[PDB]
């Protein structure tokens, strides 16, 4: 069975902060374990803030501080993104837009909603407007906490995707 790779596209306002953060985080882990080609992780922003830009200076420092890659080119929520197998929304609105645009809740999932320590349903994720050292590492924690949930999802889905 020639099962094509997964497609996790994270949707946040800007696509230069939280989205690219998890992008390099668990996706790097994927290829590090041998699943980098088995799952296509991507990202997009509903408001195309820094579309065409690169990862935000704050997140770049965060990732690089922990040894994570930081290269990425921001994209807007488009067709190819809506075609993803998993749209990791960072907020109730982003998720809503994607699904109404052509996606569905089967594909669209909240980033913190993968977090095993979440407890309650996460239909909305925080956002650090204060802009301190805490704000940056905080988001990193959000994502790293979801990676054990995002992993399982992409893994389980990519597994069942193709048969023998």
Catalytic amino acids?
Answer: 12, 18, 127
Cβ atoms of residues 126 and 137 within 8 Å: no
Q: Which residues contact 92 (CB under 8 A, 6 or more apart)?
A: 110, 123, 124
Query: Residue 5 in 3-state DSSP?
Result: coil
Instruction: Report whether 23 contacts 43 (CB < 8 A).
Output: yes
* Cα gap 110→76, rounded to integer Å: 17
12 alpha carbon, distance to own chain's centre: 9
Strands of the 86-89 sheet, one edge to the other: 39-44, 6-11, 86-89, 108-110
């Amino acid at each position: 069975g020639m099962s094509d790779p997964l497609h996790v596209t994270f949707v946040c306002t800007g696509n230069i902060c939280r989205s690219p953060m998890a992008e390099k985080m668990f996706a790097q882990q994927l290829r590090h374990r041998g699943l980098g080609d088995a799952v296509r992780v991507t990202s997009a922003g509903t408001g195309n803030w820094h579309v065409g830009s690169c990862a935000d200076e704050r997140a770049a420092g965060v990732l690089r501080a922990h040894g994570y890659p930081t290269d990425h080119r921001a994209a807007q929520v488009g067709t190819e993104h809506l075609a993803a197998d998993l749209l990791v929304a960072l907020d109730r609105n982003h998720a809503r837009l994607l699904r109404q645009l052509g996606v569905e809740a089967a594909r669209v999932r909240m980033l913190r909603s993968f977090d095993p320590r979440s407890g309650t349903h996460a239909l909305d994720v925080e956002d650090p407007y204060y802009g301190d050292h805490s704000d940056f590492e905080e988001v990193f924690a959000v994502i790293e906490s979801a990676l054990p949930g995002l992993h399982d999802w992409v893994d389980e889905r990519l597994a069942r995707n193709g048969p023998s």
